[PDB]
């Protein structure tokens, strides 16, 4: 059993989102499919589920009136619709199917099979590429790059095209009062290497096609 | 609604040690329908235990579940490096399924004071009308740390944000980055930019500062 979800979505406040989950392997109609979400830095929350063959849904009271879960037996696809979106709905949405025990397909209720998750970002912001600024170094020196004011997630950062990993810390983004993100990436290195060695932060923001190789020098 | 309490929320343990994680329910869980999941940063959750004590064939036999009614336990007989993660309990003994808030099992190591660095705004950013000052707190343990920004010795509020790395897989430390953001016009009104750091490893707060 493999569950494959639709890609990340940016949605305006008050809009509705549909997330899909296509199952391949095993049987689809006779096993319970649930949706679980996880807000950034927070816990798992069960939202609801469906049993396709019987068309029996079961929604958490918290979402009853805002959610619809449907199943299409012809495509082994389940759908989550969540309405009246608010910033608090920003989360990774996972589909989760119950497991089985033995070789007879007896269901276990608990979620053995998970999709890769779908990030839904609820925001009024427009796609924006970051500015990349050096954090210049003053036995051990610190230096880095500040990746400021981008949308949406994500940004990746390497050093020296992946050759430098020891001592690197790339921090989680913060969401600024503009609704744009900022992140920093730093590395500590020997003070003696600042004369000899070149340090380049490779920033990649695919949505804006911002690809900067920023040389950080004293 | 059944409330599942996972206390403590964090356990700091050494590789090789035993771990016992508690899940207490506000009401009896129907037919001991209690599951445990592991979740590592950036990954989907993974089922370890279902029906309080049943283990799926693929799952390491160092994981075991026990308990019934309102009182459940996940036992890890000997922590391997990959076992340092977050563990969630879940009840499914009634139509409204709930999860616990999770317990993070993290690596215990010796107290390490942060190395503190302050970075003025780049000439490049200042050309643009904004000034970001960055404070790095590097390679500290435990995770609890406090950063206060001071500008000409005035404590700042509402103009900084911070974030923390996951525990380092090699040295079991954390790092923290904080950004103070001002307009260039406001940045040019002040001389002394300071970040003041508090941590268990420091007998008194450490200040790094520069004069604009």
């Amino acid at each position: 059993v493999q569950l494959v979800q639709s890609g990340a979505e940016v949605k305006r406040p008050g809009s509705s989102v549909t997330v899909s989950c296509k199952a391949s392997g095993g049987s689809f109609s006779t096993y319970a499919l649930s949706w679980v979400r996880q807000a950034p830095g927070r816990g798992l929350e069960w939202m609801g589920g469906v049993i396709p063959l019987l068309t029996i849904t079961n929604y958490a009271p918290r979402f009853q009136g805002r959610i619809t879960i449907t199943a299409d037996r012809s495509t082994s696809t389940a759908y989550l619709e969540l309405n009246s979106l608010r910033p608090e709905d920003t989360a990774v949405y996972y589909c989760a199917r119950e497991g089985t025990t033995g070789c007879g397909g007896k269901p276990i209720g608990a979620f053995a099979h998970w999709g890769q998750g779908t990030l839904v970002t609820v925001s009024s912001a427009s796609t924006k590429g970051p500015s990349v600024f050096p954090l210049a170094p003053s036995g051990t020196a610190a230096l880095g790059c500040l990746v400021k004011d981008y949308f949406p997630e994500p940004v990746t950062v390497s050093w020296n095209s992946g050759a430098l990993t020891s001592g690197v810390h790339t921090f989680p983004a913060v969401l600024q009062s503009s609704g744009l993100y900022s992140l920093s990436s730093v590395v500590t290195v020997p003070s003696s290497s600042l004369g000899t060695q070149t340090y380049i932060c490779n920033v990649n923001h695919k949505p804006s096609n911002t690809k900067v190789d920023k040389k950080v020098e004293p | 609604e059944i409330v599942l309490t996972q206390s403590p929320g964090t356990q700091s343990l050494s590789p090789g040690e035993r771990a016992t994680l508690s899940c207490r329910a506000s009401q009896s869980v129907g037919n001991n329908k209690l599951a445990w999941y592991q979740q590592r940063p950036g990954q989907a959750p993974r089922l370890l235990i279902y029906g309080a004590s049943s283990r799926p064939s693929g799952v390491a036999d160092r994981f075991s579940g026990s308990g019934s009614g309102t009182d459940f336990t996940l036992t890890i007989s000997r922590l391997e490096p990959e076992d340092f993660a977050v563990y969630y309990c879940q009840q499914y003994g009634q139509s409204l399924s709930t999860f616990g808030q999770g317990t993070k099992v993290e690596v215990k190591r010796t107290v390490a004071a942060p190395s503190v660095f302050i970075f003025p705004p780049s000439d490049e950013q200042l050309k643009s009308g904004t000034a970001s000052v960055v404070c790095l707190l590097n390679n500290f343990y435990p995770r609890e740390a406090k950063v206060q920004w001071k500008v000409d010795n005035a404590l700042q509020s509402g103009n900084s944000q911070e974030s923390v790395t996951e525990q380092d897989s090699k040295d079991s430390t954390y790092s923290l980055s904080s950004t103070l953001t001002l307009s260039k016009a406001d940045y040019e009104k002040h001389k002394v930019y300071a970040c003041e750091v508090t941590h268990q490893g420091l007998s008194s707060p450490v200040t790094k500062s520069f004069n604009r």
């Binding site: 006779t30 096993y31 319970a32 589920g49 049993i51 063959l53 019987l54 029996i56 079961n58 119950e98 007879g104 397909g105 007896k106 269901p107 209720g109 | 129907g30 037919n31 329908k33 499914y92 003994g93 009634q94 139509s95 399924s97």
Partner: peptide, 14 residues
């Protein structure tokens, strides 16, 4: 309990 329905469905479909 909704979480028990598929077990019944499995049992009756054998």
């Amino acid at each position: 309990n909704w979480f028990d329905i598929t077990n019944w469905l499995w049992y009756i479909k054998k």
